[PDB]
Design a protein around this ligand. Structure first.
Ligand code: SF4
Ligand code: SF4
Ligand code: FES
Ligand code: FES
Ligand SMILES: [Fe+3]
Ligand SMILES: [Fe+3]
Lengths: 633, 633
């Protein structure tokens, strides 16, 4: 089972699933081999009913699509649509938060409020919204109106792009026409230009893709901004991760999906309901996280993370998961079928994300506390049905220090230099205690033994004194393998990096270092890494493509992740991906993404499937940036 | 060659292409067989990087996607994305017209103006925009602002849906939550909900698709409204069609694509430039149409239609096509390669629609007349290069009466009843001289011998006294085979229908009938058929799903056509499609689209590949509506 997942708790559940005849994601993957080579290389098109069209990667006919579309056009069009779909997911998440803030501040949803008024004011200041003499509710209404305005064309471009990157970067992008005009505007234009008989120039198509990826960045950044206003900016927290955070004697309730508008309410309400749960024979309600909505409530509330991404079915296989509360994105629909075997109550809550066979509760912000209680009462009922059943919770968990928002990282650094908090970080970059910065982002992927790329790459970078930050299921992989436990700094970290983590941690009243990896939050919270990197660039007086900063989507899967990696390249970062998207069928497209995009944005993709080799290439990328700044390496 | 196209001019060019070694769309289609069965049935998914996933239509594993996505989910998600892509094309077209009108009326583009002020005022009245005491330029600015506002969420739903259908229809759709909230909003929500790990309920997914198809209707209707304001509402015109409208001794310039903002300027400017052309040795500039932008300038100016859709390469094969001026949609990118052989100057003009190897001219409304002259001068230069080359223009053309906007049809009927113009039409429906109405819409498709379905179905319906209206390349097919020539009424039309066409034509000072088929315009002008049908429903006091009105997308291809057929079903019409979209791999999805959608909207799809059988099924659908109204049939 270690060929399927490197996580020991997942291996134990895989053994249980096998002997109980419950099919898993890995079984369905095995039933799919050999996968289609046309799809895997990107040489397939179904964008009109003369198709499906395919192109042999090598050999004889077919060489060209029926309408005349070349390999490079078909590949670029497919890639553009996956960026647009990713932008649509991140932007829908942000849009739903914008409506929630608007309703809260108009008195239409009393369960929601301005929890971080400091964040509210700095955002409004960044957007040019005046704050002096204004009520908080009026400022917030202006912020929510500005968020919603960025989805369509207006007299300004998308402000959640132009006000969050350095002016030099914005200018490089405006020069190439890459600034989005409206988030949903760019999504629709991608679908238009990629439909039959429209854009048929690989470079033109890919430039549209870079622009749409910046619409995705804007949705991520807007999502992080609005969630922090509504639910609070994360600060350092201590919790646990992996399946052992389930408790047989408690009502175990997983929050799963991406948007915390739902799950943050669940967290608060479940505390009100401890007495209901005890009445049923539980010790209490044990809310745990799966995927990014789990990351959200982990970052803000210390809710323990149960599992992530590809292994999400195994939380149910324990037999102890009484409810799984879903909003949208990255939910394997198999959970609705597996629930018939495991007893779990799977509950959908969003109108546009239902699963056949799951119970649906029509969540509304106006009725959030009522809905939470209805859902949690179903979880209580499910616990009573299993009172007296054996469960198999693997007794495996790690300690997780997390909550490292960019504001938290600044604050932590400020204990070393109050009025110039970025300087201690840059000092240790310059003197070599910090070789560079690597962000791990994105999903797990059944194609890759779970967590194997994240941990292998992280281990080599940390020994080489790279400061490693992480989001999404990359944070989940690293967290479940001990990389967020400061007790592992001695084992994992090079001497220079250990010295820096120790200095910062000691100055922050901790008695020990910061953890080996800094957890920056959910997938939209990749925007926090952008805020940190832009602040470093501004403090250094250079553009982002001169910083020793790289990204690694080491095991990615989702269209959202494809978009993130694309905007990481567009804002100037060398960006490793550990699973190839369907692009190898066009050498010209591959050359653009790995080489010539350098001349447009200064970033570039690093395609490398072997993780030890990927780590070497990321180190080389970091060290080239170091040399370009005149630094030793 | 008659297995490839029923059009004799196309057959002659196919013979020329074969002996000259120029590959055509039919050759590329032959090089594609056997096409992928997974793609053709819809049982393939590439929406995440764990894919490609496929499902055997029958037999053993794979039975389910890797994430657990069932056949019905995979099929419904693929269909939803094709509706959204179609909506994105029609809405981009309309959006570009909205900007053109705004710039014209703000004094930013002097080449554009309010040409139809009657249309401008009736639209503003329909939208609730006040007109009394307002300058036309201020009313138009309000209309353009309202168009652009329908692309995003606001305090009203999409007005180009709710103000163009009868209130009873709007209410049926609101009850099912099918009213779009914003055009680009719905497109982005489709891409979100269909991405990995989101909506996984076939009925929920398809209800989203019906809503997005109404966003496509709104873009069509808005596109027609704005083009009529800017360029004039069509009125009856006489012209010709097919390749014989090319002239060896003239500069032959094709306008090709969809958006007439470009080609309407070309038409006017080319007249200014007759003397330049004569100086080069041409008789003049001969502008001809291809595809829907050809339909636009045919409807408004009587520009002859050269060819359409699947046969567009054959206009170049004559050797006489000096320029092909492109905007976007339905352009085979092969034209840029074929131009190397034929001498044609292929010119792209839109920023998001370029073709490798074609010349690009950056069209801007602010500089439209200048751009037109630059393009036409390239066409003149190309004519000089072929002075003394042999051309092979097949001497084949038909006479085409067209220009039947809904306003023109009302006006024509008003000569029989001035103050109740719809009544003579309804009279002859009731007494049986008109059995019903059939709209032919959509593309040609290389899978179907060109025009064979359109003409076979039209012939049987016309003998059965159906009033036949047509748009897009369905109008092109019928027009190139004589169905728009009133001289063919005796041969084609049943006695009841002939009597009605003759009565209307005689009352309109024509000496003969209306043509056998009424040309309602381009693809977005399918909205005119909606206006006509809604007006009939309102005059009759019933909803559209009680009218003896059907639609036939007899040979369709493009994602735009998939969307149109879907909203034809959503507004209540039995809707035949003559090529199946990728849906046969899910019987539950097929059952929804062909049967149970009846209970939601009253419309339904008719899947029928055999055209004689399709005609019988359309007649049965028309006759069931007749019976439901208590009429003989
Ligand atoms: S758009 Fe072109 S390549 Fe794609 S399916 Fe249609 S004919 Fe084939
Ligand atoms: S979304 Fe599901 S079915 Fe589609 S490619 Fe990904 S794993 Fe396969
Ligand atoms: S041929 Fe397999 S993905 Fe299309
Ligand atoms: S397997 Fe052929 S279309 Fe995907
Ligand atoms: Fe996840
Ligand atoms: Fe066409």
């Amino acid at each position: 089972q270690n060929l399927k997942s490197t996580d020991r708790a997942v291996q134990q559940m895989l053994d249980k699933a096998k002997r109980e005849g419950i099919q898993t994601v890995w079984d369905r993957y095995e039933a799919m081999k050999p996968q289609c080579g046309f799809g895997e290389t990107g040489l397939c098109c179904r964008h009109c009913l003369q198709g499906p069209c395919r192109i042999n990667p090598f050999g004889d006919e077919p060489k060209v699509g029926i309408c005349g579309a070349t390999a490079e056009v078909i590949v670029a069009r497919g890639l553009d649509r996956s960026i647009a779909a990713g932008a649509a997911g991140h932007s829908g998440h942000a849009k739903h938060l914008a409506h929630t803030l608007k309703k809260a501040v108009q008195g239409k949803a009393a369960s929601y409020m301005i929890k971080d008024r400091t964040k509210l004011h700095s955002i409004a200041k960044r957007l040019g919204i005046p704050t002096e003499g204004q009520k908080d509710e009026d400022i917030a209404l202006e912020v929510a109106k500005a968020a919603l305005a960025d989805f369509h064309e207006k007299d300004t471009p998308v402000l959640w792009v132009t006000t969050v990157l350095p002016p030099s970067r914005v200018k490089v992008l405006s020069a190439h026409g890459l600034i989005p005009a409206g988030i949903d505007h760019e999504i629709a234009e991608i679908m238009h230009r990629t439909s039959m008989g429209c854009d048929a120039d690989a470079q033109n198509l890919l430039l549209g893709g870079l622009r749409c990826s910046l619409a995705d960045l804007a949705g991520c950044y807007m999502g992080t901004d609005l969630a922090d206003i509504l639910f609070g900016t994360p600060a350092p927290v201590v919790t646990e991760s992996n399946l052992g955070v389930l408790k047989a004697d408690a009502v175990n309730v997983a929050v799963h999906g991406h948007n915390p508008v739902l799950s943050d309410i669940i967290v608060s309400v479940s505390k009100e309901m401890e007495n209901e749960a005890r009445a049923a024979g539980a010790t209490g309600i044990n809310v745990v996280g799966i995927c990014c909505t789990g990351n959200e409530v982990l970052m803000r509330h210390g809710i323990p993370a149960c599992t992530h991404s590809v292994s999400q079915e195994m939380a149910m296989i324990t037999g102890a998961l009484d409810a799984m509360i879903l909003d949208y994105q990255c939910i394997q629909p198999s959970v609705a079928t597996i629930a018939e075997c495991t007893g779990t109550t799977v509950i959908t809550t969003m109108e546009m994300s239902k699963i056949t066979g799951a119970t649906h509760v029509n969540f509304a912000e106006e009725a959030a506390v009522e809905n939470a209680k209805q859902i949690l009462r179903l979880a209580i009922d499910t616990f009573k049905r299993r009172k007296g059943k054996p469960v198999e919770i693997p007794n495996i968990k790690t300690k997780v220090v997390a909550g490292f928002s960019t504001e938290a990282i600044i604050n932590a650094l400020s204990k070393l230099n109050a009025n110039d908090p970025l300087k201690p970080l840059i000092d240790n970059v310059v003197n070599g205690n910090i070789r560079g910065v690597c962000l791990f982002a994105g999903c797990n992927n059944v194609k890759v033994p779970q967590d194997q790329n994240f941990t292998t790459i992280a281990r080599k970078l940390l020994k080489q004194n790279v400061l490693v930050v992480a989001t999404g299921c990359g944070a989940g992989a690293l967290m479940r393998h001990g990389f967020m436990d400061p007790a592992n700094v001695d084992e994992l970290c090079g001497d220079g990096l250990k010295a820096v983590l120790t200095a910062i941690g000691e100055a922050n009243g901790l008695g020990g270092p910061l953890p080996p990896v800094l957890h920056m939050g959910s997938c939209v919270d990749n925007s926090r890494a952008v805020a940190l990197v832009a602040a470093l660039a501004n403090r250094l007086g250079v553009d982002l493509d001169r910083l020793p900063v790289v990204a690694s989507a080491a095991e990615h899967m989702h269209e959202k992740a494809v978009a993130i990696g694309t905007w990481a390249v567009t804002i100037g970062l060398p960006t490793h991906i550990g699973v190839l998207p369907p692009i190898t069928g066009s050498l010209p497209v591959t050359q653009i993404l790995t080489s010539s995009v350098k001349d447009i944005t200064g970033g570039y993709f690093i395609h490398e499937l072997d993780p030890e080799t990927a780590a070497d290439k990321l180190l080389a990328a970091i060290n080239e940036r170091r040399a370009g700044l005149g630094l030793p390496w």
